[PDB]
Structure 1
Amino acid sequence: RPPRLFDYLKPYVLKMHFTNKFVHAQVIHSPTATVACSASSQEKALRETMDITRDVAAASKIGKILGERLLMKDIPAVTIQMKKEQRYHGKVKAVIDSVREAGVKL
């Protein structure tokens, strides 16, 4: 529904959201089942290492983690789908800046 496909198919959309216990984010395909990348602080390997799992620190951390798991997994670009109340300030600013400085281009 969101993008109203125009000329060039552009799968691999990044979308993020924030429960006030863990920051979750995904980069999902147009088949939209097999999550091409899934970066969350709720993960096994990330409950313990990351401590403050709800501020901009965990946010930017998840962004960096992903961006590297992406550049290394060969999806060198991605399109952002902010949910209805989001805005590029704060907890999504961190995800965005981190995946943009990880190497990816948006």
Structure 2
Amino acid sequence: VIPPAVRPPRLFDYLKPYVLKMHFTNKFVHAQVIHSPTATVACAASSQEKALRETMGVTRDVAAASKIGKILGERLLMKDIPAVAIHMKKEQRYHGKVKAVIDSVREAGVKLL
């Protein structure tokens, strides 16, 4: 079948302008928080960064995803962003690296919307 175009969820009562999106490659893990009204990155954490690619041994596994999630949660609380909304792609489930990033963000003290 022809795949339908993916739409953001429809607004019901409130805006919720901060959206968390995750990306994983063969070498690095990524996590971007997007400000939807301006299409700008409010906060981002990845193991490809110059300050982070040497402070951890493995930059591609589940442990790296957990570390990047904790770093992103601390950075989000530093920018006074109390809560984010989770966006999963077509192939992403609540398992493995996605689960590690989500659990580390929630454990850092950021509410999930």
Q: Give the ranges of 4+ consecutive aligned residues of structure 1 lying more than 2 Å apart after TM superposition.
A: 31-34
Structure 1 residue aligned with 2:63: 57
Q: Could you tell me how far 1:7 is from its partner in structure 2?
A: 1.5
| DSSP-derived class of the 1:63 partner | helix
**Structure 2 length normalisation: TM-score?**
0.89
The superposition leaves residues 44-92 of structure 1 with CA deviations (integer Å, 9 ceiling, x where unpaired) of 1111112201111100000000000011110100000001110001110
Task: Tell me by how many angstroms 1:2 deviates.
Answer: 1.5
User: 1:85 & 1:56 partners in 2: Cα distance?
Assistant: 17
Task: For structure 1, list consecutive stretches of 5 or more residues without a partner in the other structure.
Answer: none
Structure 1 stretch 93-102 or stretch 48-57: which is displaced more? 48-57
Question: How many residues end up aligned between the 2 structures?
Answer: 106
Give a deviation string over 1:16-71, Cα, whole Å, max 9, x none: 01001000110000135320001111001111112201111100000000000011
Distance 2:19 2:44 in 1: 12
What is the TM-score when the length of structure 1 is the normalising length?
Answer: 0.94
Supply the RMSD in Å over aligned alpha carbons. Answer: 1.1
Q: Percent identity?
A: 95
Higher strand share: 2
Aligned partners of 2:38 and 2:87: how far apart in 1? Answer: 13
Match of 2:97 in 1: 91
Distance 1:57 1:82 in 2: 19
Unaligned runs of 5+ in 2: 1-6
Larger C-alpha radius of gyration, 1 or 2?
Answer: 2
